[PDB]
Design a protein around this nucleic acid. Sequence first.
RNA 1: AGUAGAAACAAGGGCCCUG
Lengths: 772, 696, 51, 50, 158
Amino acid sequence: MSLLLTIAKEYKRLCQDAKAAQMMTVGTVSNYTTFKKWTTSRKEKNPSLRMRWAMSSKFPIIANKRMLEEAQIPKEHNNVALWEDTEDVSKRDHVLASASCINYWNFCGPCVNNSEVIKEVYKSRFGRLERRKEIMWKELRFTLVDRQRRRVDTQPVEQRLRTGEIKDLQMWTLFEDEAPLASKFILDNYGLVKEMRSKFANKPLNKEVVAHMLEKQFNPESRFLPVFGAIRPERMELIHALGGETWIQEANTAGISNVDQRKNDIRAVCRKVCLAANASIMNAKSKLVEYIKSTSMRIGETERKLEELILETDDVSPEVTLCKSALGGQLGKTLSFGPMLLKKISGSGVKVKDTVYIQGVRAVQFEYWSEQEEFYGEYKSATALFSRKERSLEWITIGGGINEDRKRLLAMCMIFCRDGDYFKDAPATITMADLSTKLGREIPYQYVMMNWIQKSEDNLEALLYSRGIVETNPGKMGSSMGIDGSKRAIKSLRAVTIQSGKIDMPESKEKIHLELSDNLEAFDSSGRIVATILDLPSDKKVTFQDVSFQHPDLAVLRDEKTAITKGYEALIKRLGTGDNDIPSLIAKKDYLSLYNLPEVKLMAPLIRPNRKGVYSRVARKLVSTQVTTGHYSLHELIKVLPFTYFAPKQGMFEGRLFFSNDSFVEPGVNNNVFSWSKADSSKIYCHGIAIRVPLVVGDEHMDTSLALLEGFSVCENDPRAPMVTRQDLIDVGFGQKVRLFVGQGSVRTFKRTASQRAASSDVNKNVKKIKM
Amino acid sequence: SKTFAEIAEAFLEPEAVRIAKEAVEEYGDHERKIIQIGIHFQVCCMFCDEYLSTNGSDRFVLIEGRKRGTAVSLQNELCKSYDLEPLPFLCDIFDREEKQFVEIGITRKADDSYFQSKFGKLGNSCKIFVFSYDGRLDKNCEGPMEEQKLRIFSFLATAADFLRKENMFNEIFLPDNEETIIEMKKGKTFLELRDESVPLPFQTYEQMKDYCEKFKGNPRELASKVSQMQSNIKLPIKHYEQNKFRQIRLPKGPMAPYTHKFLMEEAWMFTKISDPERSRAGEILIDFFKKGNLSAIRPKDKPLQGKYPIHYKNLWNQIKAAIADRTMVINENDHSEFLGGIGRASKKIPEISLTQDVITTEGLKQSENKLPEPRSFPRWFNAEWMWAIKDSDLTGWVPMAEYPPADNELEDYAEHLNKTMEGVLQGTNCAREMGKCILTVGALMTECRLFPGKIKVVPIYARSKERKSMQEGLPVPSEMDCLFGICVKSKSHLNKDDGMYTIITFEFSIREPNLEKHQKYTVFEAGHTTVREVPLYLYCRTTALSKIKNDWLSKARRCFITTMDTVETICLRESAKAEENLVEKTLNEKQMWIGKKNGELIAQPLREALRVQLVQQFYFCIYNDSQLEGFCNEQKKILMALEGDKKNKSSFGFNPEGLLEKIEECLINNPMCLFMAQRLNELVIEASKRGAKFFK
Amino acid sequence: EFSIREPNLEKHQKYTVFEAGHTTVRMKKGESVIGREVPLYLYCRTTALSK
Amino acid sequence: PMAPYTHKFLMEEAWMFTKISDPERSRAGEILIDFFKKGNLSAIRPKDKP
Amino acid sequence: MDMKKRIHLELRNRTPSDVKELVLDNCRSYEGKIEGLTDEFEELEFLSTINVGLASVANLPKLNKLKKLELSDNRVSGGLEVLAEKCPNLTHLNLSGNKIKDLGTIEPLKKLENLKSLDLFNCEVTNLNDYRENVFKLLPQLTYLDGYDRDDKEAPDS
RNA sequence: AGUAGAAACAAGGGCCCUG
């Protein structure tokens, strides 16, 4: 308004100068950032000192002037000063004041209507508080603690994201007029944005603060700390008040934040799909990638794509590793040999060949590494630090707390190093059948011995005996391990050391881009294997909740419901741009041409034939009523259209619309067959399966340009087309051109015609056509 | 991040990433070019778009991703089969419905330069299409399919936004054909220097580069030089057991006198009851003035010791007068001017206005810094240490905040222990000195901030609370305001930190002085005071302060923190070894050595030894200087050697004599260092009865 | 327990309450039945018992 | 303060979903599963803040 | 969205003086307060405002020719006295889904002598004893209630 | 006078201002 005119006058006055003109004319807008630093630069060494030296003054604070006049803030209220008319040297539009004035404001100052929005701004900290309040403390005890150091997360966070995904989210929730082009993360996560926007809209707020708080709300604070007991963010946030080196405040904190359930579900899904793809013999890679992209899952309220969550988590499991490898997702330098965990500290080496005789004479190649190396190892409640040297376990130290775990870790370590005579001459019990190739897929002797150990405890005992046994020398009695896993004995194993106190887990902020084979075995720029499918449980049955296996092979439904779902899918795919589609027809109010679509003609056979006319009448009725005016809900037409193909008739409509398979849908209420919500207006749930509706048109519910962006695209710039805003963008015609401003310092030309194709296939196919 | 490939993987398909990687490896070019190529390749892909001809066959056939030789082979194969002319250069894609190759280009500059160069190079042989990240197109034929254009412009827009966000949208990562050679613009002067900073045997950076890039390891010469250097050194190694530590040699001379600004043991104070209304200093100093004792004082012109007594006397009279005027202000006279160092600041003399003749008149040699002089061991320190351990007839000397609520046993334990310690400590004498320093320094700092360029009057006081007897008698004991003396500042124009603003101290005592200890003071005989009647003395001196000292002295509550840390650590460590609450027992039973008496050792429970550590910390806060810093930094070696002796660890060293020298170097005219050094000598002596590595 | 009636603070003190989406109500309409959507509440409470 | 509700269940403020009774599934474990099949319970998703 | 944009959109260049009906359902109004309405709307005879987070009708401007209103899905409580002054020629009203605690709030509506039908569903008042009869005795001018007249006479379509 | 250290202060800018 008048303010706008004032800004224009100021811009004019400023351009009248020469230097300001040169700087606002040369270069791009990014220079602004630079200019933001050369100004207002001043620091202090000991702010505490200067704060005590300043607050001892009369007016140590600055403040706005007009805000005080408008607020009617007086001076010398009760013989105590609050401020005096002056001009600070830096701002030139601020006036000195005292701290007392702040109290005045807080006590007899202007009041806003409501302020509960704060609870949303700082939700993380109110969540901390609530989690605290729901705790049941317990007694206090004194004792020594085995505090292990390690990297963990201290901030419970749902839908952990990256930074590039967060920067756009802030802009799309607060500054939409200044928004950039729509990124994929937005189009995919629409309901999330809608939620975050519903709260911070039509409110008096400082927005920078909100953006900072959102960054904190989406950041898991990772720290390298000493830790004891279970590992959960709910605890690490207050670990300081649970136990130290000498004391422990017992307390139960198991039933809060429901975090690890999500991770175990994810890992179960990964295992399932990995096994599925393994069922193949030549395309398990593409099979797995398809199973991935053909799957989704729910998180709290929202539905997220699997491949998106997998690239955000940090669960170092032999399942997640494979997936993140298929999708080209980088990851850390962490190994996995069966159930155990490993991490290399130092050393090097290279592969080498050797053979062993299984029964009598049966040569079988097995490899090892020819050098000295050092490794950390972590099994359940047990730690170890060992070294391998030319097919031998040189030394090892342990700091666990259990005998069974100790023995299992030791055995898996001996195997990992091919130490012992068994690798020189395998036992009679094993045979060529147990060797490998369940159905052709070979197996190195390593995992062979692994399963041979997991089979019987006596194999494990014999393996331990394979390690040298001697008499426990004096003094070392405490640092010794028997066959049962006892901290001391009269005769103990060879080259072993025990101690109380776990080992400090190493650390490295490194990333690596690895690959894998057609047999699901990943490699890392070397002959080393980081993961496989033999190191995970064999198999198990589980009933996954809130999941979508929209893939034929990964499906249990029959042809009937599947046919219905595919008909609905095709009918939605006709929700795109271009004439002959339903949006253009609605705009033209051609409610009749919809009845003659081919998709309804393909779904018609599924309708109950003895009452198809009556239902048809009702459907057509609703459609006309919605179309003639303009007040429609897109989620109801897509539901009732399949019935409008036939001819109307007369009869009593009970209220339900049945198909030929005793499955119905009701017009207005959600049911198992067709459900949706105003929260997430970009999804349609049929038989549990989810369907993503494109964003081409927006009904009464959708209340922004976000619902139109999948209908637009970029095109060659045309200076003839007009320049408009983001709100009039809805009044254009399908196939038209228009210029527009995007983000900052950028103008382009758009056309309301979509392109459903992506780059994945158009690249993969064209590539495979080159390897011939 | 961490590599251009990972970056490209952000908005590209890893397939094209690997493709462009293998390509650059083939041509062995800088791997910063992974991006451009991938983009071109992906464009070609999204061009083909699974389009089909009338015969149901593929229309476009890729040539870019393939090898160069294979690509040329296929190009010639097609030029032959379809009977086309072979092109001189290679292309990217070929179509069948038209039977003419097609070349794709891309650029950022909004100009035709790239398309003009390409069209000159190839004329009109084949179809060329160059897109721009900002929505432009230049070609030599009809436009492509619509969908192709849309999908290409959209992809390019996203990529350009990403790059601009990563600051990589420059010629470096997106160069044209020509600007493909980036290099540091090595000038002339820089080279002239680089060829001049080379080590001796070489004389040009080229020789050094050739020697380093090809350097090979010759372990034998290395080991030989190692041994040679190992023979011409003869590094001494000295196991302490054989080579013991002598005692420390303290300096010799007079005794180290009192240095702290305020008196602690010899201080006498007048007390009154505190009213919440009158709580400021300028008020209490008058309240105490009305009853007449502060005015009853009337010193005489004959001092027991000191100098310039007339100035002090006149200043005291002026102080009384100002107090009577209800204005804590003083006028600038000759006396105050002399005591406040008003005009005794040097006068400046520029050299431009100086000649050899001016120097001869009045000698202007370089100032001969008169470093401090040594001192001897003070015999009055143990007295103060023993006096600062006993109660003071009151408590609450040091203000403290309140205790918050509690919900779990942990906070209960913490509160209990903290209450015990605070109640034990608040009753001592060191505590009243801490509170005195706190409040007086606060007042002085406020004054220096508000009333500079003006001589003021500030009291030396404190606030406390009489102890709590049983419920019998008068309950709810009252509070008390105590006054130990008077203080005065002088124009604290603290233009800069580390500055100096001279204060003056008028204190009250009932104990005659000693020349060795109370050397700087100037005592007067005032009169008598009650308790019966007793004589009165008036200790007077001069000193100064700074912002730094004022601030650190006001923050004198850290000693509590340190002491609590030590004690709680001991108690928790003793309680954990047995897995039981052993805190009260550890405080009432565990004995700690304190000192010697009659040649025997002395001990008392920790509950009473806390006071020793507290006084130690207080003195560290008081006498802190560079000397004490160096000492306390160099004494750790001795303690570690002692510990090694206790555990039969055969310690050793290279040159202990130098360590003793370094230590004894920083012992000058600072009582605390001397005291602690003598006590350390006594420690090693007493331990020699139980340990080695020490000489007598 | 399920409910379609928001609570009052006094009578409902031992109860923890939520808001669980919506539901439907059914009533006659001439010779047919209709359905009118309403909210839905969830009443949470703990208590003991004996034999 | 006023005396609050004490009984275990709700009398007047209650609510109930309905379905037809099958004598072959006349048990709690079966009735509950059947009620759950139609998916009206799964729709019950209480928000965080009460 | 927002009632302002919704309205400006519904007004496809049409003056706010020749319309006979308006709808603003599934919108939002800050502070539950009307925004964009004036006395310019004279020929308007129908209105529909549903699920807009409204809480009071104080701002509503005078509208004489209006003869039907819908305020369901909101949380209006104790603002019924204003309706008489602004819209005295009103006949049909609907409030199902709002915060109505007692019959005292509904007394002002007696002054709407032109009132014929009223709709109260899902409100607390309905959970009382002898509410339909007591209401009828309070508002004798009112004939239909929630779609049913005395003796439970189902009302016709329209 | 004094401070403290291994050099600095014991006001500084233009009759007026300031940490």
